[PDB]
Every structure is written in structure tokens, then in C-alpha cells.
């Protein structure tokens, strides 16, 4: 019951120090605060940071308000993806550090060869080529900072929070006469529902009504998950007597170790976890089950008749065991696909965005200049490429809910963990490298030659920057459009809204009206109105967008044609 109305100081402390990326961006503020190495403005990090920090604060302020009112009237689990996400952020640091030093070495020699004799690159600081190369190491840390995704975290709670609510609202996972819907009481364990390997179930209170007779739909729910290749263990009952009598039932129900006291219940859970390194979901009711609920990666608590006491000590608390089908096959399965598709696109669209600086490093003396508007870095992560991936993370459906139940075999995609590996992180990294290379060199070739050259000639850096950004925004927003399978009217709105919102914002940012307000902060006045009215620039953007999307379309088409996925095989057959 914290947040005593004067306690905003520890929330950022919980946000900043605990999270590896958060304090890095904080350490990044100090890096770019000193003008001696500041290659980007402080706006570039604060605005995404405050939005990312602010949204997370809102998502947690509401939670404590509920606790206060709850306590006013009366008077740790971590996902497999969370660890993978954590490591990849560090992996970006070393790559960011390596490139910054690498380009620093290239810059150090460039100053002794070209920079020294280049009289136009004289600044009065008698800096030896070793010292200039050292200083720019921090400059290339700042420019390539957005290689570390700033909205990676906040987006994850939004996807998980939204996915958890679909469990609450599911009319199919709702009990009529008891009037007890499903409830996801932890909103941070979602993709793991799609990665479940083991199920631990109590019998008295979960597989039965406790009023005992088996619970309706259990024989077909138990079989469905088995077809999804989830092993089911029951830790309950009284010796082989009750075991085989009901074990042989439920369509053969597998280890049936019975008689387990709650001490044995939690002990048995750890045996599979430590000696198999697999994700487990525990389902039960009553005090005797709360032991496994905590130890297991996912805890499920049936309302049952034993007592409304094991539900609040769990992660999901729907009313019937039969509702376990939709929790995993529908809600869990879609959550993993939605999450992995999000991360696969999230790292790509940042690498494809930042690495243009690296390619443009070779044509500016390795001097660490931005290839974009400084204000394009600010809004790229929160505004231009935030909603469409978020909507996909919530609304995407490879197959319908009814078809997902009829095909439990689509679940293995999560158990095997195929849609986001440590390898596929680099493929999205390579895909960012190539897209950035295409997003840079195709405009480069056009800009090397004549590009709409007349009294109004976009042959400059700013038009070069706008062209690369414009092709980038369309490419990534078309890339996410290629990723989505469930084109809801809101999914289409977000994709075109992001592109329209981008194109709308440049005009306001590039209009003469905003120039007078802040002439130094917003300096591309007239660039969009001049660069985007030229057919050669649009031919460049169309060519750039095409040559960076058709290979994706061709590769995507070949991959499903040569190695069709389980989803594609059944998605092709509508019936």
C-alpha cells in the first residue's frame, strides 16, 4: 500500500536502477549532456524516456489506487522471454561499444590522413589524431544509442496487460450459475502461457465439482492439451486406488504420484524445473495446493468448493478446468505468437533505423553525424512505430479461436520456442543491417547523380535525411503490415495512421510556422514540402521501399512455399 502521495521518487528508482536499459539511457543523458562529446541533443532521449517512463508509471499508479481503496475500507516470476530480452539488451551494448570504437579507430586515422590536411575541418583544438579518435568514441555511443530500444519495456507491459484482459473478458471462459468469470491476477506472465511444458493439477476441486463426479469437459480438455504436447501430472488423491480409478478415466488422463502432502507438492514441482529446465503451470484449489502454485512458473486457481483461498495466491483464477483449453490454446498460444512477432519486428525496426548512421559514417569522415532529423529519432520509437506493432501484439490471429481449438498442434510452436530464438535476434539484426544499407545506399546512388536538380534541387543532406526517413517509415509500417495476419479495421488504421501521422507531423515540423518558434531545435523548414513534391525523390522512395520489401515478400513467400509452417498449412485450407 505504497504511493502515499509523496512517493513518486521510488517508482523511477524501481524503473531506473532495476531495469538495465533504463539506467543506461540515464547514463546516456550524462554522456550527451557534456558538449565535448554530445553528438545528439538531450531531447533525443528524454522525450522517449519520459513517455516510456510515464506510461509505465500510469500502469502502476492505477494498481496501487485499488490497494488503497481496498485497505481504506477494511479499517519472483519472470518469463523465459524476459531473460532473453535482458541478454539481448546487453548484446546490443557490446555491439554498440564495438562499433563506436571501430568507427573511432577509422576516425582516428581519417584525421591524420584527411582531417589534418583538410583545412576546412579546422577548429582550433590542437587535438592529435589519437585524441580526436578517442573523443568520438563517446560521440558514436550517443548517435547509435537508439540501437538499444527505449520503448522495448513499456510496450511489453502494454501487450501483456492487454492480453491478460482478454482472459478476463472471455465469455467462453465464464461460469454461469456461479457467475465467476476468468481472472488474470498477474499481468506480466502471458507469452509463457504459450510456452507451457508441464501442467500440475489437483483432482479434488479442479477436475471435479467437489459436489465426486468429473468436471464437465475435462475428458476433452485433458485430451486436447495432450495433442498440444503438454505433459499433464496429477499430484493428489489417495494411493493407486483413487489414481487408477480416475487416471484410467478422462481418456487415459503421465505420472500419478499420489498421497503428496503440500510439502511434497512443491518439492515435486522443483524436480522437473531444476532437472529439466522447463516451464510449468500449476492448477489447483484449496490451501494444500498453494504450495505448487507459487513454485510453478504459472499458477492457476480454480474457485472450487474447497475454499476461495487458492485463487488470490495464483496467476489465473478461472472457474472451471475446462477453461484451460482457451487459456493456452487460444490466449496462451496467441500471446506467444503476438509477443515474438512484436520483438522480431521491434529489434529490426530499430536496427534498420539507427544503422543508417553507420553507413553514413563512411561518407562524412566517420564524424558521427545523424542521417535523420534529431526530432525524427525522438518520435520514431514512441509515435511512428509504436501503435501498429502494439495492435498486432493484441489483435493478431494466425487462425481463428474456433480453429485454434480444433488444431491443438499449433501449440508446439511455443513449447519448442521457434518464433523468437537467440539466433532469430541476429536475423532481425541482419535484416536491419540490409534494410539500413538499402535505406541509405539507394538514396545515395540517386543523390550522387542528379535528383530533381533545378532551381528547387533536393541534392542536400536534409533532403537526403528526409528521403531516408520517409522510406524508412513506409518500409517499417509496410513491414508490420506484411507481418499482421488479422487485418482488423483498426490494424489497417494504425499502419496507415502511423505513415499518415508521420507525413502529417513533418509538415508541421517543417512548416515556416514552427521555425520562428524554435529556429535551432527544428531546422528542416521546407524540406518535406520541397523533397516530397519531386517525382525523382518519390521514385527513389518507391524504389527504396520496393527494393527493401519485395525481397522480404519473395523470401516470405519462398519460406512458406518451401517449408510451410503449421499455421500456413491450415490457414490455406479455410475449411
Amino acid at each position: 500500500y505504497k504511493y502515499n502521495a509523496f512517493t513518486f521518487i521510488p517508482m523511477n528508482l524501481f524503473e531506473q536502477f532495476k531495469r538495465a536499459a533504463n539506467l543506461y539511457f540515464l547514463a546516456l543523458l550524462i554522456l550527451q549532456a557534456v558538449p565535448q562529446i554530445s553528438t545528439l541533443a538531450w531531447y533525443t532521449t528524454l522525450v522517449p524516456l519520459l513517455v516510456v517512463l510515464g506510461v509505465t508509471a500510469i500502469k502502476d499508479l492505477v494498481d496501487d489506487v485499488a490497494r488503497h481503496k481496498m485497505d481504506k475500507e477494511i479499517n519472483f516470476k519472470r518469463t523465459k522471454i524476459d531473460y532473453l530480452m535482458n541478454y539481448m539488451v546487453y548484446t546490443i551494448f557490446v555491439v554498440l561499444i564495438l562499433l563506436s570504437a571501430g568507427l573511432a579507430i577509422g576516425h582516428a586515422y581519417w584525421e591524420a590522413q584527411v582531417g589534418n590536411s583538410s583545412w576546412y575541418l579546422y577548429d582550433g583544438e590542437d587535438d592529435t589524431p589519437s585524441y580526436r579518435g578517442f573523443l568520438i568514441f563517446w560521440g558514436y555511443i550517443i548517435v547509435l544509442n537508439t540501437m538499444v530500444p527505449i520503448s522495448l519495456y513499456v510496450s511489453v507491459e502494454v501487450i501483456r496487460l492487454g492480453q491478460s484482459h482478454f482472459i478476463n473478458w472471455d465469455l467462453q471462459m465464464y461460469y454461469a450459475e456461479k457467475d465467476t468469470p476468468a481472472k488474470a491476477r498477474t499481468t506480466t506472465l502471458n507469452e509463457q502461457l504459450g510456452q507451457i511444458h508441464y501442467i500440475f493439477s489437483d483432482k479434488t476441486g479442479t477436475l471435479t465439482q467437489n459436489i465426486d463426479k468429473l468436471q464437465d469437459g475435462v475428458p476433452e480438455t485433458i485430451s486436447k492439451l495432450a495433442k498440444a504436447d503438454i505433459k499433464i501430472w496429477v499430484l493428489t488423491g489417495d494411493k493407486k486406488e483413487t489414481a487408477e480409478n480416475i487416471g484410467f478415466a478422462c481418456e487415459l488422463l503421465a505420472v500419478i504420484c499420489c498421497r503428496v502432502t503440500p510439502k511434497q507438492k512443491a518439492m515435486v514441482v522443483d524436480l522437473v524445473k531444476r532437472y529439466k529446465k522447463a516451464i510449468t503451470l500449476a492448477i489447483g484449489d484449496g490451501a494444500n495446493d498453494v504450495n505448487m502454485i507459487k513454485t510453478a512458473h504459472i499458477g492457476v486457481g480454480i474457485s472450487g468448493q474447497e475454499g476461495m483461498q487458492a485463487v488470490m495466491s495464483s496467476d489465473y483464477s478461472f472457474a472451471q478446468f475446462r477453461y484451460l483449453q482457451r487459456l493456452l490454446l487460444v490466449h496462451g498460444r496467441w500471446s506467444y505468437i503476438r509477443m515474438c512477432k512484436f520483438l522480431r519486428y521491434f529489434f529490426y525496426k530499430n536496427f534498420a533505423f539507427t544503422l543508417v548512421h553507420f553507413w553514413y559514417s563512411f561518407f562524412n569522415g566517420y564524424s558521427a553525424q545523424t542521417a535523420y532529423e534529431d526530432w525524427f529519432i525522438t518520435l520514431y520509437n514512441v509515435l511512428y512505430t509504436s501503435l501498429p506493432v502494439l495492435l498486432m501484439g493484441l489483435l493478431d490471429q494466425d487462425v481463428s479461436d474456433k480453429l485454434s481449438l480444433r488444431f491443438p498442434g499449433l501449440y508446439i510452436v511455443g513449447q519448442r520456442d521457434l518464433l523468437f530464438n537467440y539466433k532469430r535476434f541476429f536475423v532481425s539484426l541482419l535484416h536491419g543491417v540490409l534494410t539500413s544499407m538499402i535505406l541509405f545506399f539507394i538514396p545515395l546512388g540517386a543523390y550522387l547523380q542528379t535528383v530533381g536538380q533545378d532551381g528547387e534541387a533536393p541534392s542536400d543532406y536534409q533532403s537526403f535525411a528526409v528521403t531516408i526517413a520517409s522510406a524508412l517509415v513506409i518500409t517499417v509500417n509496410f513491414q508490420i503490415g506484411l507481418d499482421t495476419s488479422y487485418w482488423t479495421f483498426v490494424n489497417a488504421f494504425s499502419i496507415f495512421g502511423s505513415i499518415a501521422l508521420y507525413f502529417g507531423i513533418m509538415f508541421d515540423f517543417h512548416s515556416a510556422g514552427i521555425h520562428v518558434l524554435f529556429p535551432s531545435a527544428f531546422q528542416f523548414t521546407g524540406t518535406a514540402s520541397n523533397a516530397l513534391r519531386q517525382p525523382y525523390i518519390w521514385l527513389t522512395i518507391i524504389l527504396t521501399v520496393a527494393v527493401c520489401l519485395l525481397p522480404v515478400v519473395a523470401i516470405r513467400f519462398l519460406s512458406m512455399t518451401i517449408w510451410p509452417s503449421e499455421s500456413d498449412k491450415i490457414q490455406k485450407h479455410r475449411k
Binding site: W119, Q369, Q449, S520, G526
Partner: protein, 328 residues
Amino acid sequence: KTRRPDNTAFKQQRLPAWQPILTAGTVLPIFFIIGLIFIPIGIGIFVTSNNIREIEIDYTGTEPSSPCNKCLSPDVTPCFCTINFTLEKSFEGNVFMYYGLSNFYQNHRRYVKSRDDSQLNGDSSALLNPSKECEPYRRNEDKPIAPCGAIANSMFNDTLELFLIGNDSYPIPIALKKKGIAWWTDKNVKFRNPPGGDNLEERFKGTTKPVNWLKPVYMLDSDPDNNGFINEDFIVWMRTAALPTFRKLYRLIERKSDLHPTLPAGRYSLNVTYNYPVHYFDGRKRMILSTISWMGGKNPFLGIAYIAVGSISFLLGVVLLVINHKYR
């Protein structure tokens, strides 16, 4: 616990939606349509680009036997070349003359940041208080340099003159107007002189010329509409190039009153006042003449690129049928 969940399309994940599946009949057509549309676009750009007549004269003179090599060691400050070139085919329509600089990293980070935007906008406060970004050229001796920044200081300052050598052999200078060679917005929005006053002499108090500039920013052009911070050459120069090898609009050539072409085929001599030294860092200097086309300028890269992408589109399109046909 609580009442039944609200029954809505969104809450139940039953929204009406379209499920596009990349069947062999939906992605193949866009490949040929892309290939069928790109090739004519590539052909149109390529033939149009080749129909543009361009001539470039590289006049820096680093190599021996170039007849102004003395300008690399100008014991006397004013150095002049004289390069003769011949036009095989006449130039039709508006003709633009440029200057090119190679191995000139105008996009260097220390270089690009070195400019005071508020000052360039005609700000009284930033006029006498240059931004610390243009630190090396904030002030020279006692007062701030009005066009601060490395870029403004290191302004291309040659003077390329084009002459027509007729049968009589007497040179005939051709018309050359420097006005209207910059973006409309830049002249009227982004770049402005200090406000107030009518004469530009009285509008720059307590500010010296940049060290590299021979003379201050008062009399860049006799035309009052093209002098000062809004000078067309200055704006064109300050408009940072994207790449080290770049070319910038320098002069215009308008349609001649007579029916004859703007630049009839013949002998032309380029008399250039060599003032810009770029040979220390292996810099090249060029003068480029080009004619307007109804579809942009001379971009063989875009023309060739569209031919290629339009072509590999067929190659991808045609090949993808083989995979489709085999695995039907």
C-alpha cells in the same frame, strides 16, 4: 464473483477482419505488375536522362600540363585558368551551370554543427552572440563573426565564366544569372538578414567578416535582394551537401530570344578565377553544364535501377512460378 463479461466484438476477439494469405495468385501478380510498371519507368528515366546533354570541365589542375597549374602555388593571390572545351551537340531549353567539389566532406559532424541557426534567421541576440557550436569562428579579434561557423567561413569562392568562341575567334560571354538558384523557402523563410534599417551597411554592427572570406557579407551581390545572409550562392553553399563528392547550383542560362539553341555546338572557353584551394586534401573542382528535361534531371542510376528492379521483379516473378508449379 462478478457479473458476466460484456459481450462485444473487441472484448471477445471476434472483430470483423480480413485474413490475407500470400497464395501463389496474390503475390505473383504484384511481382509482374511491379516488373511491368518499373521497366517502362526505368526506360523512360534512362532514355530521358541520356537525352540530357551534359559537359563537365575539371579545372583544379593538380596534374601536369593543365594550363593553370600555377594556381596550386599562387605567389600572386589572383590566379586564372583558361580551359577550352567543345560542344558536339547544341543545348536546348533552360541550361543550368554548376560547380562540383570532390573529396570535400561538407557533411562532417564538426562541420555541419558549426552554424548558428538563430543568427542565420536574422536574430538580433544571436547576431552579436554566436552559438558556441560555431566555436572556432565565433569571433576573430574583438567582435563576433556575423556568418559564424566553419561552413560559412569555408565558402566556395571561385568565379566560373563561360565564353563562346565563334568563327571570328573573338570571345563572346554568354548570359549567366545567379538569381533563383536556391530553394524558395530558404530565401524567404529559413535564411534572413538582421531586421531593421534599409541599407545593409547599417544593419551589421560589431561583426567582422569570417577569416577565410576575403571581404565581408555586405557586398556579396550588388542586388539588394541577393546580398547578405540571403545571398543565393551563400544559401546554396550553406545548404549542406549529403556527400563529399557533390555539385551545387551555381548559375542559370535562360532560353535565348533567337530561335537558336541556348548553347549552340562550338568552341567554348572556361575562364575561372582560381581562389579555392582544395589540392592539399586531394580535392577536385569542376564546372558542369546541364539542360532541363520534362522529367527531372540526368539520373542514370535511378533509370538503371528501375530497369534492374523491374527486371529482377520478373526474375523473381517468373522463378516463383517454378516453385509454385512444382509444389502444387
